Design a protein around this ligand. Sequence first.
Ligand SMILES: Nc1ncnc2c1ncn2[C@@H]1O[C@H](COP(=O)(O)CP(=O)(O)OP(=O)(O)O)[C@@H](O)[C@H]1O
Ligand SMILES: [Mn+2]
Lengths: 166, 163
Amino acid sequence: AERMLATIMFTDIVGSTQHAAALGDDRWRDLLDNHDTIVCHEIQRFGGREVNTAGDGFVATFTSPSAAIACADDIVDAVAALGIEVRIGIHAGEVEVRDASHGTDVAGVAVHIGARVCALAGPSEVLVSSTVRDIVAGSRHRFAERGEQELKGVPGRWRLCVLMRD
Amino acid sequence: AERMLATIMFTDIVGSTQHAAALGDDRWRDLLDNHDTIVCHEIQRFGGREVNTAGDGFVATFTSPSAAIACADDIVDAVAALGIEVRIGIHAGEVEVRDATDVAGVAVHIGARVCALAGPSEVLVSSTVRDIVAGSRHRFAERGEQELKGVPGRWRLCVLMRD
Ligand SMILES: Nc1ncnc2c1ncn2[C@@H]1O[C@H](COP(=O)(O)CP(=O)(O)OP(=O)(O)O)[C@@H](O)[C@H]1O
Ligand SMILES: [Mn+2]
């Protein structure tokens, strides 16, 4: 492995648990396979790379912060077409790449920060660390600043920004 | 090929974020790799089938609730030998079996959730799994009624008593 700079994207179906319960396993299952084939499609489209992909959501790394943001914005719309909303979290940082000619994985506190931003993201909302915003500054993307959302005893403090889509 | 009865095991490292900070990404990565070889080995040992990551953790299905419970208690000890503790959650129910091995259904969400309620080096299970192995050597202590989030009902959770 090597320490590499990367932009990490985390996806999560909103009220996924209530959803499965209000639907039944048969329909829930079908809805899941649709979402996965969709999201996985967008990610690959925008040159992203799926890393370990966990639960009712995904995790992917992009070599371009802009791409990752474009992907996330497109995903939010493509899944809303299924009746379900997704919440997305993005972060960028160096990470240990447990890479492999298959399911190449990643690890480091950067990964935990991403996952943590995803959890704070609202329905059909793309949330990102101020880190992600500063580093694409100069691009067409714009964001609104939420403020400081102290993260699970993580060293320092973090501000989060919502991508203003359209 | 359809709806199947299964015992699902969810594992997760306790305070995996306090450990990475304290270790630094380099060491955290190696450890993580040791843990994964260990857990994955126990699961395979006890005939389990990984429907594999719960991020910093695993998810596996067993055709025998007893086996799954024996795998989980062995795991708790084998990882404590690395300096880190795991929390484990078990549940049993029918589940939708599928593609891209993977499983799905509200039973998976229930498991994933009695894992999050599990303490360090603790094996937590739904009253559902205590009930299905009643008659075996395993014993449990009852926590009471929890309102597992997003879930209908109000479940009773039980702690596996280990030596
Ligand atoms: N196949 C799978 N493998 C591992 N985990 C899975 C999984 N399917 C679902 N999950 C679980 O789904 C849960 C993740 O949190 P969410 O799914 O976002 C519930 P929530 O955070 O309460 O959303 P909500 O507030 O909209 O109800 C985790 O417990 C996760 O491990
Ligand atoms: Mn969810």
